[PDB]
Symmetry: C2
Subunit: 123 residues, 2 copies
Amino acid sequence: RIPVIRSPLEIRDTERKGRGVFALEPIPAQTCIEISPVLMFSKEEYEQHGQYTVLNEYTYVWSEGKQGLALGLGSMFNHDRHPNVYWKKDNRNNYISYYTLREIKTNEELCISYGDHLWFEDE
Amino acid sequence: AGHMTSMRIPVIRSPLEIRDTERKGRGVFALEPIPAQTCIEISPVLMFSKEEYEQHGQYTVLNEYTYVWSEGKQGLALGLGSMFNHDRHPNVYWKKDNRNNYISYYTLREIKTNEELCIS
């Protein structure tokens, strides 16, 4: 259901800027670089408790007021105003897939939008 | 003396897959054999303070996934580390890096195609 995606990625973890995902070699546009299984929180447990933790910084809104944390590499992409990675949520199989918006050059950070949204590729 | 730290960590591309299991929910399975003592995953840990875990985090489904850490902290393994089922006869062991907040996972023995990789 979710096998290894052998993308040329590494994680940089610096005292300065924390963690981020960076390209080891060039990557073509529209390449699936990550499929993250999601840890799902019910609306009530997130509203009552989850939102008061560091979860708040990483989760993705989900259907019916649920809230998902992306496992795999998904929580490691930083947010940027000019993102080069976009995502798709899968409600049936509980994952999020990441893709490149354009050609990525080596040493570029992979970054997603600050924005969230609620539609699913499977709907 | 010295400077700020800086690490570049591989995303280990082990031949592993996530599948749903009947009894235990999602689990991690081998797509091909794997030698013993092979590093199959290095998971970044998202850390919860003692206080946010005791007040909030333990009341959520985090409670089912986190690893006890020093000083009443709890770590949630990102990467594949939260996806391994627990088993009485594990074929994977882990080590915590307390300096950097990672967990590394290594095969205890050779793994067969289609075997489920489990920790204790």
